[PDB]
């Protein structure tokens, strides 16, 4: 009768509702509630994520309106599907992820009212390059002071999916709460239709990018390649032959030998091949 290793099943539209609401008010700590379904002991799912109307207080238990939620939940019973909340979320743009002074209290109020109520922290100012630092957490009780926390029993995936970094284990890990693993519920009827409407172009794959700027682009690159070739000429004729293998390894440039020599040459080669082949095909097709 204890936890081992839970797994949070998030949906594709769940995280999309998380990023847009987090990006919406960035300097005002957006705050909403997480709605899912406890399917068994140690797997938990969430498909539908709604937001909450915020207040002057901010992320707290007071911004959670009870009469708005039950009015909202009742109207969701007839449209879509009725279910019970399984947690909450908030946004910490000022730092990474850890449970704040009042985040731990509203966690206690939710796991006393609901069952376990996993809290999700999303940093909207970090989800920028190609990755998101979304993490969820779960409070452990203070009664297990003589037993080691995270009662893992039959699992070896816990070394994966994140290790606790120095910016995480300073605030509350692992003595207050613990981390949890989250995977992505990918399936068909969602994934291929997202790709075919985002990264897909029908009329664009056969255009010609008319040759005012096209052959013009094949001229500014020849000059800088020539100077690199003359610089490549300068090093190859030079040929220091006193202690060569140490002089080569302590004096690297990472731009002379083959870095700036074939990079643009490859780019100019592929572009005119694509351009001429698309030019030849339309001459085969169009009369």
């Amino acid at each position: 009768a204890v936890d081992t290793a839970e797994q949070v099943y998030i949906s594709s539209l769940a995280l999309l509702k998380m990023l847009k609401h987090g990006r919406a008010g960035v300097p005002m700590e957006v705050m909403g509630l997480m709605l899912g379904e406890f399917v068994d002991d140690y797997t938990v799912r969430v498909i539908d994520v709604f937001a909450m109307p915020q207040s002057g207080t901010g992320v707290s238990v007071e911004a959670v309106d009870p009469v708005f939620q039950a009015k909202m939940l009742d109207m969701l019973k007839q449209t879509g599907r009725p279910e019970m909340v399984v947690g909450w979320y908030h946004s910490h743009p000022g730092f990474g992820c850890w449970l704040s002074g009042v985040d731990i209290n509203t966690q206690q109020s939710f796991e006393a009212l609901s069952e376990r109520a996993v809290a999700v922290v999303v940093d909207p100012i970090q989800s920028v390059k190609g990755k998101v630092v979304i993490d969820a957490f779960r409070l452990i009780n203070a009664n297990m002071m003589v037993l080691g926390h995270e009662p893992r029993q039959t699992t070896s995936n816990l070394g994966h999916l994140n290790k606790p970094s120095i910016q995480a284990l300073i605030h509350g890990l692992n003595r207050h709460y613990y981390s949890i693993t989250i995977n992505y519920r990918k399936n068909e009827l969602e994934q291929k239709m997202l790709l075919n409407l985002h990264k897909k172009s029908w009329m664009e794959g056969l255009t010609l990018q008319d040759y005012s700027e096209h052959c013009k682009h094949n001229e500014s690159v020849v000059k800088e390649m020539l100077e690199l070739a003359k610089n490549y000429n300068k090093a190859v004729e030079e040929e220091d032959k006193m202690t060569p293998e140490q002089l080569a390894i302590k004096n690297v440039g990472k731009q002379d030998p083959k870095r700036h020599l074939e990079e643009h040459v490859d780019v100019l080669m592929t572009s005119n091949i694509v351009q001429c082949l698309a030019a030849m095909l339309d001459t085969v097709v169009f009369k």
Partner: protein
């Protein structure tokens, strides 16, 4: 061996039954292990005292069971009973499983020894004791048919909780490993159709045991017909090993099924077919297998 002992009966006749079924070969091996023994106690102590309040009791009791397998000596369950009973929820499960591993093979003596721990009388509120007990009885009585398959059959027909339905079916599948009995096959099907998401890895492992190298025309279809519309990942992983363990050494008789699991977008089923192509190809230098096994790896 089950086929010839049916053809043989179609004294020296009673002598040639016993040496083609195998009791004494267990016994002289059991006689060999109780005579010769080399296990140092000090190293096990130096591993024991460096264990903090983490989870490592299961790691200790799996270690001594490995290094006392068939030794049949109880000293760690005797000198520190209180240290072993410190941890819970699976450490009592694994230790009473490990008690069967040390007593690897008596065929009667462990049955009259573990008759003390009845599965209605150990503790009403600890199913890990009786569940690991029926798991341990299946470990000791493996590849030995008789009453014990039928006696574990009557216990699964009247189960108390789902914890016991793990070690019951794991005990029953290992006892009936390679038998392909219809009665254990009928109850393992309807156990899977109970639709309970804690015991699918209990049913999925056991179904591959009783159908090991069988190539049934309906088991593979019913398993791959079940593991599409479910909603958990254990139930995927339980049937994953079961559809791998159901075939063993077919060498051309799974090649469409290997393609059927690999073309699917299910990551567990693509994982499962890699076990199935590995088990159908053992000791075989098939270039096309390892061509297809490595091309799908990268």
């Amino acid at each position: 061996l089950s086929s010839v002992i049916q053809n043989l009966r179609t004294d020296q006749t009673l002598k040639m039954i016993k040496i083609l079924s195998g009791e004494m070969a267990i016994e002289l091996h059991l006689q060999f292990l109780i005579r010769n023994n080399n296990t140092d106690l000090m190293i096990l102590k130096n591993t024991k005292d460096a264990v903090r309040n983490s989870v490592c009791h299961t790691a200790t009791v799996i270690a001594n069971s490995f290094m006392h397998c068939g030794t049949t000596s109880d000293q760690f369950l005797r000198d520190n009973l209180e240290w072993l009973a410190r941890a819970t929820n699976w450490a009592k499960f694994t230790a009473t499983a490990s008690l069967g591993v040390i007593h690897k093979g008596h065929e009667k003596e462990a049955l009259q020894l573990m008759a003390t721990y009845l599965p209605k009388d150990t503790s009403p509120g600890s199913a890990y004791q009786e569940g690991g007990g029926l798991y341990a009885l299946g470990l000791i009585h493996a590849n030995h048919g008789g009453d014990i398959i039928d006696y574990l059959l009557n216990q699964l027909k009247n189960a108390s909780n789902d914890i016991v339905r793990h070690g019951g079916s794991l005990g029953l599948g290992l006892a009936a490993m390679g038998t392909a009995r219809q009665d254990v096959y009928d109850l393992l099907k309807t156990n899977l159709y109970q639709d309970d998401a804690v015991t699918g890895e209990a049913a999925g492992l056991a179904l591959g045991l009783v159908m090991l190298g069988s190539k049934n025309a309906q088991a593979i279809e019913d398993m791959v017909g079940y593991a599409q519309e479910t909603q958990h990942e254990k139930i995927l992983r339980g049937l994953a090993v079961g559809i791998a363990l159901v075939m063993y050494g077919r060498m051309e008789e799974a090649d469409a099924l290997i393609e059927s699991l690999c073309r699917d977008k299910d990551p567990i089923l693509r994982r499962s077919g890699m076990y199935t192509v590995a088990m159908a190809y053992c000791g075989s230098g098939n270039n096309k297998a390892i061509r297809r096994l490595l091309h799908v790896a990268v």
